[PDB]
Design a protein around this ligand. Structure first.
Ligand SMILES: Nc1ncnc2c1ncn2[C@@H]1O[C@H](COP(=O)(O)OP(=O)(O)OP(=O)(O)O)[C@@H](O)[C@H]1O
Ligand SMILES: Nc1ncnc2c1ncn2[C@@H]1O[C@H](COP(=O)(O)OP(=O)(O)OP(=O)(O)O)[C@@H](O)[C@H]1O
Lengths: 311, 311
């Protein structure tokens, strides 16, 4: 097996220009705040499985690794809101994640607000990264509960620290709900999936560097005329479904001792990770799926909105 | 009677490839942690009566028998959380199980956290095995109380010692509740029941080696065309109900001096241990139960989820 080779196939990061744009803006957002004046506050949108969490994890490592190794400093944070979050819930989650208080027994919302305003300049917080902002949309109705948004405005104005709220694109209406919180988050970037198949685009050079990063020694066959068309036909832009197929195909080619990823175990990997794919979607790998013009259209505008459009 | 023979029938371990996978990963999880850097932290799921407690007991014996015989060292632990556990409750249970403090009079959660962090490197703890993780799911509501989970993250980061949390499959949502605790427990294995009857599978060789291990001298008749079909028809994959039937049949054949386990006392053992079995299930042993295609389907995906799906 060589689980070292398996973890090498699973932990493969390839920097796209969109990711490097987000990382440059994140480094900018941090280094601009003097923690006296009002911070910059970026909002980053992005659909289901574009690589937002990977961006936050890549930033976390490249920023706070040596500083966390130095001592209890924790310069940048990573917060994942709970579903249908109250200000007290997201406040105490922010508290128990940041350093080591108790903070989750005494829930009175005011004294724990005083605690984390006492503690944020104490440890030396430079940035707050919130991952889930679509949780403030109620599930079945379309009201967006503005208690956490107003509390975020409160904690932003009380202790001047830059907040980079990540979320799905239909979380925009939560920022549209509060006009003050809308005015605060000026910088808005859209981390949207891969665009076209025609070749010599960002998708080809991405698959070229991922072909380089795969643990096979000689070639993996990606980013050629035939296989790139079949790859985009399987996974439109969704980074996660593409990486899942490549991961399942890689570990399949590792299991039965092979040369590289070939058109032997890729078909098996396609039939394996085609459970989530929609009703009218066709698997381009099986017996005789002539990959069409209609399969290779760019992803729509409302790609990460559909759950909001469903009600 | 010969209670020696009875204890021989009761204590019968047969290693499956799934159990050897869990034991190899457990030995790996222990021997990788240097107790300076962040440990590996495996999660092992498994339904109601797959043989989790037998795996922990087999590991406990094969690991810590000679070291516990040497002196007060206790390298590996075995912890069974109480129901609706608070951090102080599971903390003091961990304390009073590990070595010999008093530890269960002074409940202040902070000084006993300090006590067990003082004591874990003192005695030389190498591994912590937690058996019940589904207790952190509240009974009638579907909130999963995250105080014990956050305390487990706390004790993991404070003293770097590998924790192998066992539990039922619907305990997964407790690991989904805390994103940091989710990120920590990377290695996740599913100890699921036996799959098919068709023959020449893991079930046949399992019953072959269990036929060997039984205290009868000549044969027990298991893992043949007829009896294997009747055996899977009685107990789908549930190791405990299979082993109970075999145990009751064995001690029935021991009571009235017999040659082996025959189709005389097996019918009596079937009617004896068929109380727990569901409403629509049929006993394949009684008078004329022609064992059908519909009886021998593999166990479902959500085999250990049903109590979570009930509310
Ligand atoms: N630049 C990259 N190179 C290679 N793989 C990548 C890259 N970016 C992301 N991935 C992969 O994409 C997958 C998507 O996981 P991730 O959780 O980051 O997505 P996400 O968009 O945050 O999902 P969600 O919206 O559900 O939170 C991961 O398996 C990750 O390894
Ligand atoms: N490999 C094996 N060979 C023979 N018998 C086994 C094997 N594994 C488990 N058993 C038997 O299966 C039964 C189940 O016991 P055990 O408590 O280990 O299951 P469990 O899934 O942990 O149950 P619970 O979750 O209720 O604690 C025991 O009687 C044990 O002897």
């Amino acid at each position: 097996t060589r689980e070292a080779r398996i973890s090498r196939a699973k932990r493969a990061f390839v920097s796209t220009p969109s990711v490097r744009k987000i990382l440059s803006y994140m480094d900018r957002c941090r280094d601009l705040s003097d923690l006296e004046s009002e911070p910059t506050c970026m909002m980053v949108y992005g659909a289901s499985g574009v690589g937002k969490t990977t961006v936050i994890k890549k930033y976390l490592n490249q920023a706070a690794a040596a500083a966390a190794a130095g001592g209890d400093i924790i310069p940048v944070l990573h917060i994942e809101l709970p579903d249908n979050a109250k200000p007290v819930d997201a406040a105490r989650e922010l508290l128990v994640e940041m350093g080591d208080p108790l903070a989750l027994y005494e829930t009175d919302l005011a004294r724990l607000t005083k605690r984390l305003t006492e503690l944020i300049p104490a440890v030396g917080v430079k940035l707050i990264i919130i991952d889930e902002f679509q949780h403030l949309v109620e599930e079945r109705s379309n009201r967006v509960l503005t208690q956490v948004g107003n509390w975020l405005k409160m904690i932003l104005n009380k202790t001047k620290c830059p907040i980079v709220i990540f979320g799905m694109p239909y979380s925009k209406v939560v920022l549209q709900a509060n006009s003050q919180l809308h005015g605060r988050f000026s910088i808005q970037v859209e981390l949207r999936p891969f665009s076209y198949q025609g070749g010599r685009g960002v998708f080809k050079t991405f698959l070229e560097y991922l072909d380089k990063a795969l643990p096979f020694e000689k070639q993996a066959g990606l980013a050629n005329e035939s296989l790139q068309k079949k790859l985009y036909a399987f996974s439109q832009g969704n980074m996660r479904s593409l990486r899942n197929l490549i991961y399942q195909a890689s570990i399949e080619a590792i299991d039965n001792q092979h040369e590289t990823i070939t058109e032997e175990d890729f078909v098996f990997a396609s039939k394996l990770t085609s459970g989530d794919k929609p009703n009218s979607w066709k698997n381009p790998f099986e017996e005789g799926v002539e990959v069409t013009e209609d399969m290779l259209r760019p992803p729509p505008k409302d790609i990460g909105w559909e759950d909001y459009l469903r009600h």
